[PDB]
Amino acid sequence: RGSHHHHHHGSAVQVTFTVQKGSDPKKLVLDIKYTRPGDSLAEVELRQHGSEEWEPLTKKGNVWEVKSSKPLVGPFNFRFMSKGGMRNVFDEVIPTAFSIGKTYKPEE
């Protein structure tokens, strides 16, 4: 019959980034969806392109916001840490030109 080998695949995490009304040149607001089986997102950091200093995001309600003293340059990098203490890093998840109302997931 239809056997369930989904467990064979092992574990998987689904993360997506969506810009919300309010994005600015020195301030960026994006909604983040993190789904992990038995785990959950605990911390997220955002690093600007051409920059080597990851900046922490503030969890606002159900989204994350980051403010810089200069203009943001894409592609942007975002690192995720699961409450269980797991960490995941996504490079080039959002390009410099982002649109509002469109989702944006991290590429391989």
Q: Which CATH architecture has domain 1-108?
A: Sandwich (2.60)
Which of 93, 12, 27, 105 has its CA nearest to residue 64? 27
Domain extents for the chain?
Answer: 1-108
The total number of residues shown for the chain amounts to 108
* Exp. method: NMR
C-alpha pair distances (Å), 3 with each of 6, 7, 8, 9, 14 = 9, 11, 11, 13, 23
Report the chain's terminal Cα–Cα distance, integer Å: 34
| Phi then psi dihedrals of residue 24, to 5 deg | -135, 175
Which of 48, 99, 39, 57 has its CA nearest to residue 75? 48
70 CB contacts (<8 Å, ≥6 apart)? Answer: 26
Could you list the beta-strand ranges (E) of the chain: 14-19, 27-35, 41-47, 55-56, 58-60, 63-67, 76-82, 86-94, 103-104
Which of 88, 80, 84 has its CA nearest to residue 38? 84
